[PDB]
Amino acid sequence: QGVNIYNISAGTSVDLAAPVTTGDIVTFFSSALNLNAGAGNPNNTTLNLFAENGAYLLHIAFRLQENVIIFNSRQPDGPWLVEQAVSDVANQFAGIDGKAMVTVFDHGDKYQVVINEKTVIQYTKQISGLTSSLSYNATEETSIFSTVVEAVTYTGLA
Amino acid sequence: QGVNIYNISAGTSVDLAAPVTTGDIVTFFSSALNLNAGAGNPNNTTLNLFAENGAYLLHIAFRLQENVIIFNSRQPDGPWLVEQAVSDVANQFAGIDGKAMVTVFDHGDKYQVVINEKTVIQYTKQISGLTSSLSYNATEETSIFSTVVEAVTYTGLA
Numbered sequence: 001q002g003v004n005i006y007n008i009s010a011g012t013s014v015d016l017a018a019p020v021t022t023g024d025i026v027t028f029f030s031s032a033l034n035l036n037a038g039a040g041n042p043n044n045t046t047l048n049l050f051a052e053n054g055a056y057l058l059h060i061a062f063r064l065q066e067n068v069i070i071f072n073s074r075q076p077d078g079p080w081l082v083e084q085a086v087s088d089v090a091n092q093f094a095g096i097d098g099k100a101m102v103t104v105f106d107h108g109d110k111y112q113v114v115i116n117e118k119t120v121i122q123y124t125k126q127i128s129g130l131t132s133s134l135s136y137n138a139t140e141e142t143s144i145f146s147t148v149v150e151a152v153t154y155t156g157l158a
Numbered sequence: 159q160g161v162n163i164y165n166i167s168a169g170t171s172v173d174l175a176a177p178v179t180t181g182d183i184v185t186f187f188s189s190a191l192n193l194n195a196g197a198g199n200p201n202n203t204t205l206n207l208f209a210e211n212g213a214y215l216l217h218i219a220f221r222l223q224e225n226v227i228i229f230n231s232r233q234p235d236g237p238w239l240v241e242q243a244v245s246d247v248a249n250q251f252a253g254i255d256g257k258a259m260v261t262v263f264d265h266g267d268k269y270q271v272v273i274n275e276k277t278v279i280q281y282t283k284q285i286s287g288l289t290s291s292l293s294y295n296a297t298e299e300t301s302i303f304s305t306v307v308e309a310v311t312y313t314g315l316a
């Protein structure tokens with residue numbers, strides 16, 4: 001078992017030293033929380049788990065203006081697949097201010113997403129595979145998280 | 159599976175909403191790092207996993223003056239057991255400044271301790287059982303970590 005730490009500036013991605021597979025965990029840590037950020041176009045912030053081939057295994061989109069969190073997947077150079085949506089952004093974060101954490105458990109055929117201590121969705125995968133890189137995209141203006149998001153992975157758990 | 163967050167002021171402990179058992183994980187996060195803190199008496203900082211009966215399942219002691227990290231266990235109202243020691247404190251933290259994280263994996267008959275990304279010890283348990291509370295002890299003067307340490311547990315993984 002191992003712990004890997006990464007620092008992700010908004011708009012960039014990182015390649016993992018250890019891939020995330022079934023039974024593994026990834027937690028994104030934000031040193032800030034701005035639920036009053038400007039409107040998204042349409043996203044304020046997105047967090048993503050990528051396959052080495054470029055596929056979007058899991059796409060987490062926070063949209064304040066639409067007050068919802070979208071979950072989707074997408075083949076390397078393909079169209080976005082079936083969107084799953086959880087309504088009420090601020091409710092998922094309630095209980096903790098000025099910071100936040102987003103955790104994704106890889107349960108084989110589903111991705112469990114947890115905001116702080118709250119389970120937000122049991123996302124049935126539309127695309128399977130090993131997560132080889134992670135990303136955090138947003139503008140320095142309308143992101144709900146800090147400029148740099150810390151990612152910690154817990155691998156080789158199974 | 160669930161995520162639980164706790165904030166631990168130095169010298170206090172917290173009771174877990176979800177106990178940590180075999181296959182589970184606990185990570186202590188410090189917002190500071192002072193490897194130049196005053197001498198310990200003999201500990202500068204200790205992090206602990208407790209059983210509900212008060213037993214010290216795992217005791218992690220950081221001693222700058224002795225430049226070593228001690229690992230031990232202790233029955234509720236019993237003597238300290240066999241000490242395990244890893245030498246060179248600062249080396250375990252090398253690579254990251256101003257902050258740190260300490261992770262403990264409960265592997266059934268052993269506790270794996272990881273400082274940041276470095277595995278420090280594969281502690282063979284001297285006392286088994288469920289971890290029901292965690293603590294972070296130190297003086298506001300000679301602690302190597304921040305005044306408040308954030309603890310995150312990942313339970314129900316097995």
Ligand SMILES: CC(=O)N[C@H]1[C@@H](Oc2ccc([N+](=O)[O-])cc2)O[C@H](CO)[C@H](O)[C@@H]1O[C@@H]1O[C@H](CO)[C@H](O)[C@H](O)[C@H]1O
Binds near residue numbers: 041042
């Ligand atoms: C701008 C916007 O709200 N895009 C949404 C919208 O789809 C469109 C596409 C084009 C236009 N337009 O030319 O005016 C408007 C809306 O709804 C889609 C779902 O039906 C998407 O939500 C789309 O945003 C895209 O969502 C995907 C994830 O599904 C991903 O987050 C993309 O980055 C995002 O643009």
Ligand SMILES: CC(=O)N[C@H]1[C@@H](Oc2ccc([N+](=O)[O-])cc2)O[C@H](CO)[C@H](O)[C@@H]1O[C@@H]1O[C@H](CO)[C@H](O)[C@H](O)[C@H]1O
Binds near residue numbers: 241
């Ligand atoms: C002060 C000190 O260095 N204590 C150490 C030492 O044991 C003693 C006990 C008493 C005296 N004394 O009356 O002068 C000096 C030293 O070595 C022990 C191991 O052989 C311990 O390391 C002890 O510290 C205690 O360690 C345990 C864990 O084993 C725990 O961290 C206690 O909080 C700590 O005091």
